[PDB]
Short mmCIF file of C-alpha atoms in Angstrom, two decimals:
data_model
loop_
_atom_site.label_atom_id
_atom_site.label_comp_id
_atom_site.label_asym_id
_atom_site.label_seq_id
_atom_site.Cartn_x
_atom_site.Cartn_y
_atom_site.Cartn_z
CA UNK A 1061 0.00 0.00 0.00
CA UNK A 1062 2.63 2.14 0.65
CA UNK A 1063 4.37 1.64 -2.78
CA UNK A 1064 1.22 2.20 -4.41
CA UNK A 1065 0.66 5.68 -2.14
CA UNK A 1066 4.04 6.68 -3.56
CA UNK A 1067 3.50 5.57 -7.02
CA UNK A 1068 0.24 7.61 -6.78
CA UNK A 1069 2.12 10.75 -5.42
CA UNK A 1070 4.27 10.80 -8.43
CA UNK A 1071 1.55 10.51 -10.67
CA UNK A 1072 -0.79 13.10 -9.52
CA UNK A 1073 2.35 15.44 -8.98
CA UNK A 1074 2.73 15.18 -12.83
CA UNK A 1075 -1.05 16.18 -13.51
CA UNK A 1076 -1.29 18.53 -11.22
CA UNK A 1077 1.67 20.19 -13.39
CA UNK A 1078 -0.64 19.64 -16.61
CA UNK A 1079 -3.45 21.35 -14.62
CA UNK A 1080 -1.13 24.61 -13.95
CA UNK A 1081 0.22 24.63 -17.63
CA UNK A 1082 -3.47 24.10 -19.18
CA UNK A 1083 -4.84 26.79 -16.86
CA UNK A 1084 -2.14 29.01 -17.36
CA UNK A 1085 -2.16 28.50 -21.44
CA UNK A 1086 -6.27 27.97 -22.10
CA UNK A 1087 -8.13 29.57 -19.57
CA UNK A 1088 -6.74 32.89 -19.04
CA UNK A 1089 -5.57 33.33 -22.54
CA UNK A 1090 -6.09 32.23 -26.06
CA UNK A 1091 -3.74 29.20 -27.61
CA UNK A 1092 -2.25 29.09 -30.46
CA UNK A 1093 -0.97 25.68 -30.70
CA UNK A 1094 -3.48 22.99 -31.79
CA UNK A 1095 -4.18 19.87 -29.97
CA UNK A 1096 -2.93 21.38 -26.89
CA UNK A 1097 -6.56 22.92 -25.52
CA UNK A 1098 -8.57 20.14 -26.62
CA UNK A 1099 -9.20 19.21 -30.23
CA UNK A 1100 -9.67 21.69 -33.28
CA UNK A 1101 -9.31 25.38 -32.96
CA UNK A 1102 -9.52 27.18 -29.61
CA UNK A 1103 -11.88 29.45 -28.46
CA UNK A 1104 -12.25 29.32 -25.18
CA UNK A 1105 -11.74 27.15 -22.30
CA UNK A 1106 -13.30 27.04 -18.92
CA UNK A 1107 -12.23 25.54 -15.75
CA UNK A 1108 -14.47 23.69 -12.99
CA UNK A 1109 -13.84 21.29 -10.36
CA UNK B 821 -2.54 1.25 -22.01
CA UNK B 822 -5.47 0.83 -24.79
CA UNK B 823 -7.61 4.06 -23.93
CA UNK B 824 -3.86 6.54 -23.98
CA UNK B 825 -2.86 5.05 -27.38
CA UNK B 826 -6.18 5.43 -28.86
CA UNK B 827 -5.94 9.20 -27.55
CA UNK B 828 -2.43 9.74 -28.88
CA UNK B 829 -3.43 8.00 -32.15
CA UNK B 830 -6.57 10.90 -32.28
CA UNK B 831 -4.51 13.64 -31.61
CA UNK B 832 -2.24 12.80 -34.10
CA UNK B 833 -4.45 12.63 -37.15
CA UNK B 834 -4.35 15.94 -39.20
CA UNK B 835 -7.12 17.06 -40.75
CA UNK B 836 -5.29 17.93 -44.40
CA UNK B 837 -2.70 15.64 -46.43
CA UNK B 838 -0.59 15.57 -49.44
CA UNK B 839 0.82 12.71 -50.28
CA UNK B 840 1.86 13.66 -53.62
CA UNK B 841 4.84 15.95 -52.22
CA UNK B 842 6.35 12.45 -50.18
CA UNK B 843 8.86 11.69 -53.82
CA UNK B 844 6.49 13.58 -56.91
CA UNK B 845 7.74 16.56 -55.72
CA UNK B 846 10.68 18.97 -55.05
CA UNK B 847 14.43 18.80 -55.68
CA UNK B 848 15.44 17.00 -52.19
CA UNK B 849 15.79 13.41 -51.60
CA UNK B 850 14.07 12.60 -48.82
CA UNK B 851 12.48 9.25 -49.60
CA UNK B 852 12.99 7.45 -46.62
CA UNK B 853 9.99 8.83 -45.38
CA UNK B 854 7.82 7.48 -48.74
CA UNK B 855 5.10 5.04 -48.15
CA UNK B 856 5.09 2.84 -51.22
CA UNK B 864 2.95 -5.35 -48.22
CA UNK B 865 3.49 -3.39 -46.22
CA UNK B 866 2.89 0.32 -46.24
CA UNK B 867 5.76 1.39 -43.74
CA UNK B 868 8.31 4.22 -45.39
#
């Protein structure tokens, strides 16, 4: 259990960087790389828990 | 596994092609990346 608490750790660490980059690049601005903010072009993106 | 290469597959599809430009066109050489069996450049 512990090993899998660990393994866990690491993997939400890593998402929880995604979340911060997608905010930061989607939400409060407009992207200009496809694929990135979801599929086709970008308009906007909101963010909800 | 199944699900994330079915994503990555998605996202890499483009919506446009040319394959006419892979040998029929331009001066450069770059026909290792040609699909002609198999269907593999």
């Amino acid at each position: 259990f512990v090993s899998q608490q660990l393994v866990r750790s690491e993997a939400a660490a890593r998402s929880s960087q995604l979340v911060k980059d997608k905010v930061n690049e989607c939400v409060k601005s407009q992207s200009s790389r496809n694929g990135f903010c979801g599929q086709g072009t970008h308009i906007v993106s909101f963010a909800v828990n | 596994q199944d699900d994330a290469t079915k994503s990555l597959f998605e996202s890499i599809r483009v919506p446009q092609s040319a394959p006419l430009m892979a040998s029929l066109s331009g001066d450069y050489n770059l026909s290792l990346f040609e699909t002609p069996g198999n269907y593999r450049s």
